[PDB]
Amino acid sequence: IRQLSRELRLQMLIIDNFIPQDYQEMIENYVHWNEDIGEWQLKCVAYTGNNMRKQTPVPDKKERDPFEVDLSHVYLAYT
Amino acid sequence: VANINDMDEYIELLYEDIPDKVRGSALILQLARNPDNLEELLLNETALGALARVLREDWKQSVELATNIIYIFFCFSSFSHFHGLITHYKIGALCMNIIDHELKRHELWQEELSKKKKAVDEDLENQTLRKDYDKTFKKYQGLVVKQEQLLRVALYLLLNLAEDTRTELKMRNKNIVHMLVKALDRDNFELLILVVSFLKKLSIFMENKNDMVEMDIVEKLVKMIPCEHEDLLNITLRLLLNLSFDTGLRNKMVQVGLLPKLTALLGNENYKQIAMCVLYHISMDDRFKSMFAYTDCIPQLMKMLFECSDERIDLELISFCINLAANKRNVQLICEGNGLKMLMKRALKLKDPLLMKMIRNISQHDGPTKNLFIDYVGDLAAQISSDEEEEFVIECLGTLANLTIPDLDWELVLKEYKLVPFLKDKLKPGAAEDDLVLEVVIMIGTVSMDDSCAALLAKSGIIPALIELLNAQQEDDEFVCQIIYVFYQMVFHQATRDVIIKETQAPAYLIDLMHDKNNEIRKVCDNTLDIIAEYDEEWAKKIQSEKFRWHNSQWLEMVES
Amino acid sequence: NELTRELKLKHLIIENFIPLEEKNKIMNRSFFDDEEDHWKLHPITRLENQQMMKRPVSAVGYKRPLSQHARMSMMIRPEPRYRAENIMLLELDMPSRTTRDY
């Protein structure tokens, strides 16, 4: 009981250090306890921030310095 | 010789026998050399036609008669309105065939000589080697000289014919650049002058430059850069300058070792300008700036800067110096003994914006060279106060903004030069141009590093002006980044913190753009908002509720949809 | 049992909403005091500000801060004012005339 108490205090600290009280109670209002599997079903659980970040391949191909020297425009062309 | 202006009885012998073909050619040559009877020779019929006919199929067994191809049609080719008649007989076409044939024959001769330079194992001064070799060697000279003469004059004709763009296009379509690069291998001053001049004329075009890119041309110009001829060096340098507009050729120049040679040309000659231009083009690439400090003599470049007495420093030298000042390794060489001191003294005496650009580039670096600037803060601040145009003031402001020395006293500097109202006035909506406003912002950020100035910045009203400027410049990433950095500087001073938090809505702007598309803006905003986390408990609540709402914005809008 | 129930509830919400980075940050900043028997935190600006941040070199990728006005004026105007380096605009060496007129 003591160890789980310590880690639930840790978890309390986490949620108080990031989630405000209004959002905490809203999230509590939008959660459900289902017995067949025995878990907390969160409405629209897939569209939370962590899954959205996992869905975004942020790393992209940046280009070379837009301020490079390219003096080849000075060369003429025939006709 | 004895050749009267009449022109018959000499062309009659021009198509009757082979030993006397050359005699008639030389007799006509004597006349063609005088421009007064050139017209009479021109209106002469069945005379130039016979010359072209004899040229067409009797040049492969003459060489001496092949000096009627040119020196006659070269004489006609020195004047433009005759060119058309020269192209009526297609004489420019035969010149290319002759040049290619001679180049191939020279390669065959060189291969034969190299084969005959293989029996050096035992010396016997007989048919084995040495003696006989010497014989053929002499023969080689006795031929090559003559051939070279032909090449020279033939090329000259083509050069004169290249003054027309169409004819130059026809020449390049027949691989003239390949012939010129091959001819670069010879050892003859006048022929090399002609070839390099032809190449410099051709290289202004993109396709000719691309042709001489694949046929490596810099490797054949390095062997001629330190040459003892004066005109050859000049024309080779002009060709190098024309070629230095291409990145690949520029990279090749440093691989073949052209930097030390070009800087030796920079000492004191008639090639300071062109060598400096080529070096300037080389130094626009960042990895080549460092190698100018590596033995490359840049001390001499300071001497040219200090001795050059005029109101303005020449643009080539100052541009090259500005480019060199962007490297810290070069900056250590510039600021050795007394180098920054003299540069600063000169730029203060004569208001040179370009010299001030060089000084700003020097000040951008964060070694002891930055600590060398403590004696010039007041000197720059004197010029900052809107006296010397705007190109000189902007560089002084930029240099002063670069002095991020952690224990510098800005309070006295601001007190005497009364530079704080000027900085405030430059934050007005229509005060000055955007670059000056940005450098004013960087000034404010640098000044905020000192705690003693904090109170001075609180009562001045700079913070609301910066907020208005951030509102007006919300579409510029640089402006918003620098303003937020100013805020980050002026939070931890206990006097501008109160204005930032309690009096202004700057944290509201910081919240609204914390997750910007720009990494720098995000980093500065995040670091600023950790300072405001503890000094205000309501702003911490806002910084939490925001970015939790934003982090999961879709999950909070999914109720609506 | 309801205790472990609320445990797994808060685990679920932490997994969905709280970012990983801030999560490990607040673990590294947490400290369990036995005397008061609870978890406490640490400040931020008092811990840092020894290594005060250096000014961003440029928000647009340049060598120095560069306004949009200077970007537009750099592309059209040849004035050196808007450029940190490469202030010279050299041109090609045009060929000379070899032929006379007479």
Residue numbers in the entry:
A (entry chain A): 580 to 658
B (entry chain C): 129 to 689
C (entry chain B): 574 to 675
What text does the study give?
Heterotrimeric kinesin-2 (KIF3/KAP3 in mammals) is one of the most widely expressed and abundant kinesins functioning as a complex of heterodimeric KIF3 motor (KIF3A/KIF3B or KIF3A/KIF3C) and the armadillo repeat (ARM)–containing adaptor KAP3 (16–18). Notably, the tumor suppressor protein adenomatous polyposis coli (APC) has been identified as a KIF3/KAP3 cargo involved in RNA and vehicle transport crucial for neurons, accounting for ~12% of KIF3-associated organelles. Here, we present high-resolution cryo–electron microscopy structures of the heterotrimeric kinesin-2 complex (KIF3A/KIF3B/KAP3) bound to the cargo protein APC. Our findings reveal a previously uncharacterized KIF3 tail hook-like motif, termed the “HAC” domain, which mediates binding to both KAP3 adaptor and APC cargo.
To understand how the KIF3 tail interacts with KAP3, we determined the high-resolution structure of the KIF3A/B/KAP3 cargo-binding domain (herein referred to as ABK) by collecting an extensive cryo-EM dataset. The final model resolved the core region of the ternary complex, encompassing KIF3A (residues 574 to 658), KIF3B (residues 580 to 675), and KAP3 ARM domain (residues 129 to 689). The reconstructed structure revealed four interaction interfaces between KIF3 and KAP3, including two tripartite interfaces involving both KIF3A and KIF3B (herein referred to as ABK interfaces 1 and 2) and two additional interfaces specific to KIF3B-KAP3 interactions (herein referred to as BK interfaces 1 and 2). At the proximal tail region, adjacent to the stalk, both KIF3A and KIF3B form a helix–beta-hairpin–helix (herein referred to as H-βh-H) motif, which interacts with the C-terminal region of KAP3, constituting ABK interface 1. Within ABK interface 1, the highly conserved C-terminal helix of KAP3 binds to this hydrophobic pocket, primarily through hydrophobic and aromatic interactions with KIF3A. Following the formation of the ABK interface 1, the KIF3 tail extends further to establish a secondary binding interface, ABK interface 2, with the concave surface of the KAP3 mid-region. KIF3A engages in ABK interface 2 by forming a 310-helix, anchoring to KAP3 with five hydrogen bonds. Meanwhile, the proximal segment of KIF3B tail adopts both a 310-helix and an α helix, where a cluster of seven positively charged residues (Arg637, His642, Arg644, Arg654, Arg656, Glu658, and Asp666) facilitates electrostatic interactions with the negatively charged surface of KAP3. Beyond ABK interfaces 1 and 2, KIF3B engages in two additional binding interfaces absent in KIF3A: BK interface 1, a 10-residue segment following the H-βh-H motif in KIF3B interacts with the dorsal surface of KAP3; and BK interface 2, a five-residue extension from the distal KIF3B tail interacts with the N-terminal region of KAP3. The molecular dynamics (MD)–based binding free energy analysis revealed that KIF3A and KIF3B contribute ~28 and ~72%, respectively, to the overall interaction with KAP3.
